[PDB]
């Protein structure tokens, strides 16, 4: 039952360039453990076949069999409904409030990086930082799985490695990207590093970081830079 993503080339038409759509959708193929592969499309320059097959020219697209399905979230929840237990795991959160802690990040993110005048950089930062507080609480609070259960260094602290236990989910598969997308911009453009005092938010980037289905899906730190160049260096 033919698995092909359909994805945003980077600059140099072939390699992952910066989508966290893609990236998204290319973390909950892996996490699922279906056989499939991943084509990169060249926006400015798509094939006849991709041009034929997705007509509308959405990105991503997923082929299944011979059925192409676009929109993110759509596909998302396609794959949960289509590649689902026994062959192959469940991967959607069990506690509600998982799939939106942090949610707003990056919008603030977006409306602080594509922000020009200087006036404004202040106001929009600490939206940024509020938004990952909130986060950092979430990440922070035990969830229900961990009830009373913890050593003398660290009561009332959560331990667990992700968003909804020790186990990727579909939470994360949107968060992360976007995150990801965060630091590397802000990093690059904006002087800003995620303050180390949000040590949820850390020790959940080092989780992330140390699993392939993230690390091996992230683009190019130059090809995040590349693609968000001419909005965020209007700030002067």
């Not at 989508?19 to 320059?45: A, E, H, I, Y």
């Not at 009561?155 to 598969?173: I, M, W």
């Not at 140390?210 to 899906?217: D, I, K, L, P």
């Amino acid at each position: 039952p033919q698995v092909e993503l359909f994805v945003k080339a980077g600059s140099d038409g072939a390699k992952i360039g910066n989508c966290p759509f893609s990236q998204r959708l290319f973390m909950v193929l892996f996490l699922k453990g279906v056989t499939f592969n991943v084509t990169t499309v060249d926006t400015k320059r798509r094939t006849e076949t991709v041009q034929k097959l997705c007509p509308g020219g959405q990105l991503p697209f997923l082929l299944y069999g011979t059925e192409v399905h676009t929109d993110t979230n759509k596909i998302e929840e396609f794959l949960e409904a289509v590649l689902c237990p026994p062959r192959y795991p469940k991967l959607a959160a069990l506690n509600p409030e998982s799939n939106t802690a942090g949610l707003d990040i990056f919008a603030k993110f977006s409306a602080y990086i594509k922000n020009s005048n200087p006036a404004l950089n202040d106001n929009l930062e600490k939206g940024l930082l509020k938004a990952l507080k909130v986060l950092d609480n979430y990440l922070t609070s035990p969830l229900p799985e961990e009830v009373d259960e913890t050593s003398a260094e660290d009561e009332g602290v959560s331990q667990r490695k992700f968003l909804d236990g020790n186990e990727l989910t579909l939470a994360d598969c949107n968060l992360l990207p976007k995150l990801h997308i965060v630091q590397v911009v802000c990093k690059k453009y904006r002087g800003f590093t995620i303050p180390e005092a949000f040590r949820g938010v850390w020790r959940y980037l080092s989780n992330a970081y140390a699993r392939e289905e993230f690390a091996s899906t992230c683009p190019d730190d130059e090809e995040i830079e590349l693609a968000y160049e001419q909005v965020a260096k209007a700030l002067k």
